């Protein structure tokens, strides 16, 4: 999981979600596309 | 689950399987229950044990009246234990039998006082420099006690020279070897704080 | 020999759900840790 200041969908199956007031990019099929910090 | 004893001396025995073992003799005489503090009048469950009886001359009228509600009379060492194993009432006696062979105890005692000791013997500081390479008068000096204008004060807790003395220390699980009950012996393995003929609190 | 981890659930009074309490014990001492 990488920490970036500007998260964006690195694919078409990624999902942007908000956990505890923090943006995450989750992709269960390709777990190397995980980001946070919004 | 608790007793009072007197440190007799120190010797060395041999285990049943070779090796030598240093040991300390604790004449843990029969203690007597003086007052049982319950959870209704005081606020916690405990009971006092008295160890060594006094005379009718040195004792106070208050102490005489306090121990008259009990069996044996005014004691030299009275200390309050907590969380015993068997529910017992006033006047009962506990000689040595509360300990077994192979158990662990937490002897507590008052160390012997060293008096006013410097930092080298109290905290373990080492010198200021060498002994001859220009050393003038600071062979046993503390050195510096703080920094410059920030914070412009000596921090609380700075290790300096003071009365080393003897406080209460626990020995943390000494192993019991001999629990002879006829003559109160309680031979344990290890050291014990304090000089000879000093009172110690043996917590089981 | 070999130890045995016994995981038993209980109704915690701090919330009301089903928590999990595991502990490494002897293979023949798991019966006394599951009845309590």
């Amino acid at each position: 999981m990488k920490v970036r200041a500007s998260v964006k969908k690195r694919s078409a199956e990624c999902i942007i979600v908000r956990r505890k007031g923090r943006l995450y990019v989750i992709n269960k099929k390709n777990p190397r596309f995980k980001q946070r910090q919004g | 689950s608790g007793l009072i004893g007197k440190k007799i001396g120190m010797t060395s025995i041999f285990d049943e399987n070779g090796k030598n073992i240093p040991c300390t003799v604790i004449e843990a005489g029969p203690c007597v229950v003086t007052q049982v503090r319950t959870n209704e009048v005081d606020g916690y469950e405990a009971l006092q044990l008295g160890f060594d009886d006094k005379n009718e001359k040195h004792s106070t009228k208050a102490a005489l009246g306090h121990f008259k509600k009990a069996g044996t009379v005014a004691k030299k060492k009275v200390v309050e234990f907590q969380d015993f194993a068997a529910a017992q009432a006033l006047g009962d006696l506990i000689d040595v039998s509360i300990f077994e062979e192979g158990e662990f105890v937490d002897v507590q005692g008052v160390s012997k006082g060293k008096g006013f000791q410097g930092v080298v013997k109290r905290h373990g500081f080492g010198g200021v420099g060498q002994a001859t390479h220009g050393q003038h008068q600071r062979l046993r000096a503390p050195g510096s006690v703080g920094a410059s204008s920030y914070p412009s004060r000596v921090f609380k807790g700075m290790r300096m020279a003071g009365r080393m003395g003897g406080d209460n220390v626990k020995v943390q699980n000494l192993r019991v070897l001999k629990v002879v009950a006829e003559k109160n012996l309680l031979v344990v393995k290890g050291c014990i704080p304090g000089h000879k003929n000093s009172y110690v609190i043996i917590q089981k | 020999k070999r130890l045995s981890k016994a995981i038993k659930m209980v109704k915690s009074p701090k919330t009301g759900a089903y928590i999990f309490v595991e502990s490494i014990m002897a293979p023949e001492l798991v019966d006394e840790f599951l009845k309590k």
């Binding site: 269960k28 099929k29 777990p31 | - | 070999r2 130890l3 045995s4 981890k5 016994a6 995981i7 038993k8 659930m9 089903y18 999990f20 490494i24 293979p27 798991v30 599951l34």
Partner: protein, 176 residues
Amino acid sequence: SRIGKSPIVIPAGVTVEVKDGIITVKGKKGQLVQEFSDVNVTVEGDQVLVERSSDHKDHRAKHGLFRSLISNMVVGVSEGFTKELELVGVGYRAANQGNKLDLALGYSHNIVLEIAPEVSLETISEAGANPIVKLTSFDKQLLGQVAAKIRGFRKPEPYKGKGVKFVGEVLRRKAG
């Protein structure tokens, strides 16, 4: 809103009562309780009408949340949910002694679990295939929690595939 404006018609045989904040559902598999706070739920006798008062970004979600919770409790205590785990790998063993599961994985010990009396527990390890454990309960939340804390004992590796997985539920695999 859209999922909350739907009826919760009951498969007759199960009753639902409401209290001062607590809703209870009694069927053929034990009572189930739930606590609602910002929704008005009324049982007419056949359908259960749950509605909201304001649209303030929180009640609009609590409406559907409590509707789905009540529907789940019903389609539970009435019928009940069930799930299946499957142990994949060499030397993996699973045994059942009632409400007590015994798992033998590649660890240096075994794992015995005293599953709560509110969840059934069956096992199938017939000859050589992968041992299949099956749980069944009326509480879907507790069922899923038990299944999760059983699966967490050994996560499915991506290279081979060994691990406590569900039946079906294809895994992400790599080359290695």
